A and B are shown apart, each in its own frame.
Chain A
Amino acid sequence: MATVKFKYKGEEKQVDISKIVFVTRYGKQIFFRYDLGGGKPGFGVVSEKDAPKELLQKLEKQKK
């Protein structure tokens, strides 16, 4: 579908939404975890203020 960009503790990276396990939006900052097939999982945080809303609408969907 799409590749979400985040700042993993300062490490700017883009991971496919299809590789995300769970998404937890706070209403200010979105935190989630992804599982890369390259044998390297990690976490990702996206600001709901410093990032395009288009991608934010893909992270937290209805009944997530």
Chain B
Amino acid sequence: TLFVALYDYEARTEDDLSFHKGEKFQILNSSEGDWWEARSLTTGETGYIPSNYVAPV
């Protein structure tokens, strides 16, 4: 299950991850709560991503 970013968002900390429209993330832990920690398929970095800005493909 890959998630694509609908809108771009710049991280405000090192907890959240910055991404752009069209970004593909590999959901690592979706059971963390509202914000899920995922690993980008493009950069390969880890961080929390807002579920409202992404959509499942």
Number of residues from A at the complex interface, CB < 8 A: 17
Known: A8-B34, A43-B34. A22 touches B15 (CB 8 A): yes
Interface of B is mostly: loop
Q: Per DSSP, are chain A's interface residues mostly helix, strand or loop, or mixed?
A: strand
B3 to chain A, nearest CB (A): 14
Of the candidate stretches B20-28, B38-46, B47-55, the one touching chain A is B47-55
User: In the complex the two chains form, is A9's CB within 8 Å of B34's CB?
Assistant: yes
Distance to closest chain B CB from A30 (angstroms): 8
Residues of B contacting A31 with CB < 8 Å?
A: 34-35, 50-52
Asked if residues A43 and B35 are in contact (CB atoms below 8 Å), the reply is yes
